[PDB]
Enzyme design. Sequence first.
Site, short mmCIF file in Angstrom:
data_model
loop_
_atom_site.label_atom_id
_atom_site.label_comp_id
_atom_site.label_asym_id
_atom_site.label_seq_id
_atom_site.Cartn_x
_atom_site.Cartn_y
_atom_site.Cartn_z
N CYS A 20 22.24 3.75 95.88
CA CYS A 20 21.43 3.21 94.79
C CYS A 20 22.27 2.87 93.58
CB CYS A 20 20.39 4.24 94.42
SG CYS A 20 21.20 5.78 94.00
N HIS A 77 22.65 10.32 86.55
CA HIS A 77 21.87 10.15 87.76
C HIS A 77 20.75 11.17 87.77
CE1 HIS A 77 21.69 8.28 91.70
NE2 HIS A 77 21.50 9.46 92.26
#
Lengths: 319, 75, 337, 337, 337
Positions: free
Chosen positions: D154, D181
Amino acid sequence: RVVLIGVAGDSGCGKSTFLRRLADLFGEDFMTVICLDDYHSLDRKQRKEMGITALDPRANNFDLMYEQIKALKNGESIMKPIYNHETGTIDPPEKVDPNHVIVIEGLHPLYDERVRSLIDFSVYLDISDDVKIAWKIKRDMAERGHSYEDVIASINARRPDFMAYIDPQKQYADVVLQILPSQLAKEEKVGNILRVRMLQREGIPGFEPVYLFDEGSTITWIPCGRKLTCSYPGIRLSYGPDEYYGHPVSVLEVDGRFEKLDELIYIESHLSNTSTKHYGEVTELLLKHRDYPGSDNGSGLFQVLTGLKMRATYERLTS
Amino acid sequence: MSNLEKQIEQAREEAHKICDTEGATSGQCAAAWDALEELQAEAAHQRAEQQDHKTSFQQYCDDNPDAAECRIYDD
Amino acid sequence: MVRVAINGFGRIGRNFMRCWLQRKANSKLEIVGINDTSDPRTNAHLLKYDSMLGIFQDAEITADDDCIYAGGHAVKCVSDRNPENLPWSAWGIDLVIEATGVFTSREGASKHLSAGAKKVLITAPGKGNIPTYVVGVNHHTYDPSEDIVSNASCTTNCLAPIVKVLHEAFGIQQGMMTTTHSYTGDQRLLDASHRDLRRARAAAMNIVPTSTGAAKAVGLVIPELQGKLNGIALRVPTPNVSVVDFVAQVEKPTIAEQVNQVIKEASETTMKGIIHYSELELVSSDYRGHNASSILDASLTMVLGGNLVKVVAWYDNEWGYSQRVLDLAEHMAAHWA
Amino acid sequence: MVRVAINGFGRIGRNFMRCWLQRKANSKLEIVGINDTSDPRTNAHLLKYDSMLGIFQDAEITADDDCIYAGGHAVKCVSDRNPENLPWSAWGIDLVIEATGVFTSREGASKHLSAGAKKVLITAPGKGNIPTYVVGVNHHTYDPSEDIVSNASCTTNCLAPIVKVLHEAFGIQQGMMTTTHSYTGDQRLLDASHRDLRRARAAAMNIVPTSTGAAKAVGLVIPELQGKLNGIALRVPTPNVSVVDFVAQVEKPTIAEQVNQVIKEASETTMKGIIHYSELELVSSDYRGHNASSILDASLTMVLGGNLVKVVAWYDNEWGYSQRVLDLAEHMAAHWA
Amino acid sequence: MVRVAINGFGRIGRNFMRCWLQRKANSKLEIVGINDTSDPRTNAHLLKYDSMLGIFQDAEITADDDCIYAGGHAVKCVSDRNPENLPWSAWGIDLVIEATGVFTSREGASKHLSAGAKKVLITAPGKGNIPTYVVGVNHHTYDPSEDIVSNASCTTNCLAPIVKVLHEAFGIQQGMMTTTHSYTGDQRLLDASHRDLRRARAAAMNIVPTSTGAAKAVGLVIPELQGKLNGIALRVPTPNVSVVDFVAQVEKPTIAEQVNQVIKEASETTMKGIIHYSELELVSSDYRGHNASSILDASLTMVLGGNLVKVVAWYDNEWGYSQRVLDLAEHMAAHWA
Ligand SMILES: NC(=O)c1ccc[n+]([C@@H]2O[C@H](COP(=O)([O-])OP(=O)(O)OC[C@H]3O[C@@H](n4cnc5c(N)ncnc54)[C@H](O)[C@@H]3O)[C@@H](O)[C@H]2O)c1
Ligand SMILES: NC(=O)c1ccc[n+]([C@@H]2O[C@H](COP(=O)([O-])OP(=O)(O)OC[C@H]3O[C@@H](n4cnc5c(N)ncnc54)[C@H](O)[C@@H]3O)[C@@H](O)[C@H]2O)c1
Ligand SMILES: NC(=O)c1ccc[n+]([C@@H]2O[C@H](COP(=O)([O-])OP(=O)(O)OC[C@H]3O[C@@H](n4cnc5c(N)ncnc54)[C@H](O)[C@@H]3O)[C@@H](O)[C@H]2O)c1
């Protein structure tokens, strides 16, 4: 050390955006502002009694301002009086301290010759009478005071002594910015797009000129073409060596309206000796304040160019 | 503005009077129009400061900054 | 012995008081005055029971409505928001520790000097040309007639020793930083009205970004790098400790092991007690209460192309920053004029 | 119409199923098989009641022990950890979507190809030379005989379009990144035993750092930048969305406004639907469920020295990544061979 | 059509505005005035981008410094902390919605009545004998000359319909409650100075207990149970939704299935739209945005000894409470006098 910057113009003391661009450049920590309407001799009552404007070399104590100005170099905190602007009267003075950068601005920052020997860098700021009228129409239109069109007759009555009192100071300033009606655009009101030009003077060291592609050969450049899609009417620069009042000058001149970003970085990539430590720094200094009046035309370009030369003079003076 | 609001119109009356009566081109009524332009200039200075009238934050954080609405720990 | 005071008994004030209670014997400082917007009954409880550093254990904390007895040692306490109505000359105050986050200007902080205090140490990056000093970089070069001194922000106080070491060893052209910052008290808890919009949102829920000039304060405390250091901050939902990323563009090329070697020996020669060096795979909560103002994380240091270095530094912005405040206060006590 | 399957009905699988339920009419894909380690009664509940995207509303979800009825549409479901005992040829499966985080090798993922599936799309940066493809950068340049394709992580899926735009417009010498993150499922909740020590610690409490090679995967999907991009990751206690910092060293000098202009027009010409451009002062939770794979945060873009740029990009690593997975799956359905 | 106003554009105000934007067509209420301590530029952003209910989608939100355009509908907006300087008669205000948490007294709330407003509905348990009304229990029995009415707290607004049903069906001798409450805006984020010590501590870190009298407000809205209902509250680090435990001592003996049957049929006859009944194994975040003011959790209801019952009720104290405020406002519009 003490450095000194002289600004000349009737835009109201502390009432022009060039000081705002200097504030964005230096900072009010490093510089202080000195209006020069404060050194008036007597009041608007005595102006009416003596029949005299606020432009007379009688009308100011030019010696006490010189004494405070010389005492500015010696580090001591000066005690300057204040023109009470609403009453026309004079405040008992305020004790203010010197700073890294000291500015001087008013109607006569340069009329004295000993302070002309004192000022480290000088700027006259000229205005043509047409955009004077176009700014006074906005002045009495936004306020809706309904005092228009006899201020037209105030203009030419304010004119003749002004050309005697003030306009011979520009024969001793370094940089003088004239603002004209635009020859390029015709079907507007007379004050939208400006035709501005910064007649800068050679000679005195430290001050370079800012030359467009060549020192000393007139060059009229239009940046429209293969890499810029120009809107209406686009930009039309100029340049030219000249001798103004018998003095070696170099006019750099811009007509048009900056509509977007790439046409303002593409111009800045081609000016020379602009004295930047940073690529596109002039464009960043244009677009830190999108709301300032005159950012979309060459006035905001030339004012920050002059202020950037003031950075150059300050770095020359402080090593 | 009420005081200078009156005084600008008073000096405008004087601008109509003294520069039609005592000489249209001399130092006296040029001083009169210079005065009226300075009155207009201070009207402009009042106008621009009232354009910069803050609504609430530069009042409530002017007087009481440490309230939770304007603590800034610029860290 | 120097009689000192605390303006604003918040996080920095409570940590300052707790540090002085843990460094009492070697101190030329005696804390004699505090003032908060709370009564003296509440803040003694908040001093004893910190929900971050646990219950204080070494000394006994009690109070009544006029004084606070910390371990038998009495300390005065008052409550006023106007700094001009404060009993400073009545209490004999040399140094007041500005920690409200309100009085960042020179004219704001000088109100204590006017009201009868001799020196003020403000724990914030102040507006205007206030002389800033970081312990471990330029805590020597202050003139003792400078009564209004400023410690920088916690991010600057962490970052500047690393930038000093890398500028001396390698030379720095440019440098970015991005500190992943713990949430501070300025953020509203739920989505409430606030002066800045990105601090108006919820703190426990969000990575809120913010723009800071505290990277530029390194350019104040190191003069030849001013206008070359800039960075942003990320506030994430951790309550106490934070980490700072730092990307520099050095010009003398090197590898990732050598910068770790340089900072490791600088941890043992000059920056001892400022920079700790850790070759462990620790995580954030193992730095709650660490004494160093920057723990360099060793395993993440990397160099691309020889001339582009990235370090990361753990630092506690509530305990280590208080330690540097108290060290600067003692260091200005040792050169009292 | 292409019969597709889902290996591992976790976060990526539930988001993939929810996306296909929201993009049903324009689909050449029909989801016919899933397998999780749970019974079919539980995962239908987990599909309907997501504690991140709320209750699903458009279609009805029910199940019994052999099939799942989503909005009247039936889907088969089984449970096995061995990929070799799976009814693929019995179900007629062209494309299986590997989403367990287990089968990252070629030999692991090829077990489905052996067991009777025709193509496999794995949603992980795979070990070994597996052909990786990002929608918006190089989703065209896949050969349709490549049956084992990989979408990247991602972080790479967010970062690579920005790096493509900045490499085309300016040219990149080097580049760092540091993604803040959101915490993923791999981290243990309390401090429990784990293969890597920095993921062993508590997730809700800590900024845990980790080293990732997902920055280097941009060097796979953009070939001329390989070995020039590297970065670390910071896992902070936010459940859903994340932001990525990106420091590049461009060589054609510019300012901060111009890179925003470049990415703004690239958002409207080529990267439409990939990169959104936002000049708002938003925060993290206003990107839960955004369709773009990178929202460029405009107010934080900065350039030092002309040749050193920093951007930050919000991206949802649970919804936008699923959107790019489904777009890649449809794009390989449109060029079925 | 009744011109209404909002005092304090906080959580309850933003949720009230969002509810009225979602219930516009059936409304005798037109929202024409708000006032917060923020400028009109900020709170329009806070209305559009709620970090709890996501981005608002149905209508367009914009503002300038004097008005706010919500979906083309204009609304006025001002900022003042003094309620006496407010343009109410200049705006024609029948009902103002007190939601600042400041004006809980009769003399405080009556300042709006003095300043030119006709009725005030305060969303707090007010000090003094202010007539309190809960939708679903006694929203009929208000006299329309009572211009100063009070909705109770969210906990009371959830608990009182359940207590009404159990008192009518079984008869109640005594009753305890213990609501596990989401954290509200009153708590300080880090450990900061506060009037009450248990709210002074950190909100994201702690189960903070608090004593409330909002259980006794059921004794106001049900008169024959006053002095028989008392309970405490537990604030835990969840941002939005909460659950309330309720222990009653009934006198008519029964079992756990029968009280579920009673509340299930009361959900379908009388308390429809007030009490929802759920036989699912849901969790907290599946009640963000539920319309009912109490979802009875079925699987946890228990009876010991026949005469001792415990129920638990999920309720959203930011959305359902706003729904009951708007329902009470419309119900007082329908009986305007
Ligand atoms: N929070 C951190 O970890 C951290 C780190 C480094 C620096 N700082 C700086 O420290 C300062 C304070 O931080 P903090 O977390 O203690 O703040 P805080 O808001 O948590 O506590 C400040 C305290 O000062 C009180 N106060 C505010 N204005 C006052 C006034 N005029 N008179 C008296 N008391 C007043 C407040 O009510 C509170 O009691 C800020 O400048 C902050 O940026 C904070
Ligand atoms: N978490 C994210 O937001 C995110 C983003 C991008 C990519 N990814 C990648 O997606 C993959 C899965 O992510 P996730 O959050 O859904 O993981 P998860 O662990 O939350 O869910 C994976 C599911 O697969 C099941 N599973 C595992 N091994 C299996 C096997 N052998 N057979 C059958 N079922 C099996 C698990 O029990 C679970 O049901 C990982 O590669 C991850 O790195 C995750
Ligand atoms: N928080 C909840 O979920 C909840 C539930 C039920 C009832 N309530 C009650 O609702 C009230 C408000 O709750 P909230 O979460 O919206 O509060 P909040 O503090 O989050 O928001 C209140 C708003 O009102 C403003 N305000 C405060 N005093 C003001 C004044 N004098 N003039 C103008 N504006 C002023 C605040 O600055 C803020 O903008 C409190 O009584 C609370 O107990 C809250």
